[model samples]
Target chain A: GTTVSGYINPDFVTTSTTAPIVKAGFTVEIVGTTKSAVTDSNGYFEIKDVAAGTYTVKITKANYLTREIANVSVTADKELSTSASPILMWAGDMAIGGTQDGAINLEDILEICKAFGTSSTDAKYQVGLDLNRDGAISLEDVMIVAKHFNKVSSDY
Target chain B: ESYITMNFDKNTAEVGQIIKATVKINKITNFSGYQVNIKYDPTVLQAVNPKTGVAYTNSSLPTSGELLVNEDYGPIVQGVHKISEGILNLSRSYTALDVYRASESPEETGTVAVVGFKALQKKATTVVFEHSVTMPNGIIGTTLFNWYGNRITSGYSVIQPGEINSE
Candidate 1:
């Protein structure tokens, strides 16, 4: 059986007390095929028993920029490891839900304003507003948006 | 005072012997970026080639000293150069964005640029930092910065020294 494996890391990265934003539950699909899988807590995913061929892999994680890797070759009885150089994806593409228009700009920045100072229990808090999902719309969240501001994507 | 230092891995090396002039950043906080200038006795020490790299992003250097990254996938901005007349300059820094993904920290204290030099003729020589640039504020030597993009006002007193000894 042919197997494909990869580790997903958000370009949203940091260390020493703060944790990297979770990258789990993101979708991974063989473009134009029925093969797909979901990432685990470690940002790991695998799709097994794929037909021998070359294909493109599309990744989907809401509120994060979409990523697609092309020209991935698959063979029988082996694992393709993207773990050595983990796939790093950028965050803050809030216009998602299979309709990501990309263009992370002030439009998304303003959206966080509603829950800017709020947390999970706060009155203005909303799940979609917390880019870092660290419970509050704080610097980490907004900065993620501002850093990628004015950038757009197409399945990547 | 938190500051930068050019420390030698070995104090004495024979003539035509290669040595390492490693810079160390110590006790710094909110660390973001740095611009370092070093001068040595050219007659005694000669620098290695191609003095530039991808911001030590490989974490190859011990310090969080990477400044700029490659336009491709990388973390710090790095420009290592063998400047004019016994002088060498190097830098490493981060965008205010997520550099932690590279495993570098905002609060750094370690080797940033590890330089390679040879004991030209085995004569006792000295290597030291010499930075005299108009900062956004007061004058300084070998500038250091906090993540906010402001220079660290304190640790610029780099008449600081390192040495190499031989025949």
Candidate 2:
């Protein structure tokens, strides 16, 4: 069996500097295949039992820039490592609602409103919509997403 | 006065040596759980696996509880630079409500946390506790309550340079 492993972390924006974040909870998948896994607390991830093949691995985490590494070659009994240049995702890519596209949209704006006034302590707090990254969902976050309205990404 | 004190096994350390420190909470009540934010001079010291730490399980509290360091998984450990802001956060919780209530004798003074670091530079530095004395309410509405104590803060230590200077 072949194995593919790597680390995933965010390139945080200035405002969300204090927000609690981790490399965990990211979804790592081998595109065009059923193999998938989530990153650990250390931002490390691995997919095993994969048949030998060349493939693209798509890494996705809410409120982060979705990234894909192309042409990952996996061979039988080989373990592919991605220690060099681990996935460095940026914040502000949120799919609050609607089509779930990898872009900020009106639906995302609505999400900001619904989650307005919610802080890290609140049960309804959603880190994805905390655009300003001040550990809370507020009007400022809505405006931040509005600036990126209609913008789309290939991974969306 | 209730205090969260940082105690070091050794005060003087040379570069590349591991400096060990233990945090103890003096005078605690209904000690359900606590969220302690710690700040240290990153240039003088570097945390070693900051995620793991020992808490008040058997030493201070009657029943053993779960302990998580830097539980929020903050991004501080990602870089090698010195960190002054919220370097570490420690949390402790009882297994269940019954476990908490069953233990009537809450710890008055006990060792709550222990953190280790590697001496980075030959300089004096301080570690400061930033916030919070979180406690359980034992009520349905507010499960936990927060308090600000007259915390007798901080631990001070120094690191020495390497014996052999490369000239």
Best candidate, lDDT:
1
Residue A92 shift from truth in candidate 1, angstroms: 1.0
Tens digits of lDDT, candidate 2, A24-104? 778999899899999876668888888888888888876655667788888865444454556665445555343244543
Candidate 1 residue lDDT tens string, A19-131: 33466778989998899999887778989888988888888887776777888888765444465577777777665334444545333444454344568887767877776
DockQ of every predicted complex? 0.01, 0.02
Task: Tell me the native contact fraction for each prediction.
Answer: 0.00, 0.00
Model 2 spans with C-alpha error above 4 angstroms: A13-21, A63-66, A76-84, A97-99, A105-110, A113-118, A121-128, A131-134, A138-151, B1-167
- Lowest-sum lDDT 10-residue window in model 1 chain A: A12-21
Error of 1 at A76 (Å): 3.7
DockQ of 1: 0.01
Per-residue lDDT value at B36 in model 2? 41
User: How far out, in Å, is residue B146 in model 1?
Assistant: 33
Give the per-residue lDDT of model 1 (tens digit) for B36-60.
6566777777675314422222112
Candidate 2 chain B: 10-residue stretch with minimal lDDT? B73-82
Alpha-carbon deviation at B2 in model 1, angstroms: 54
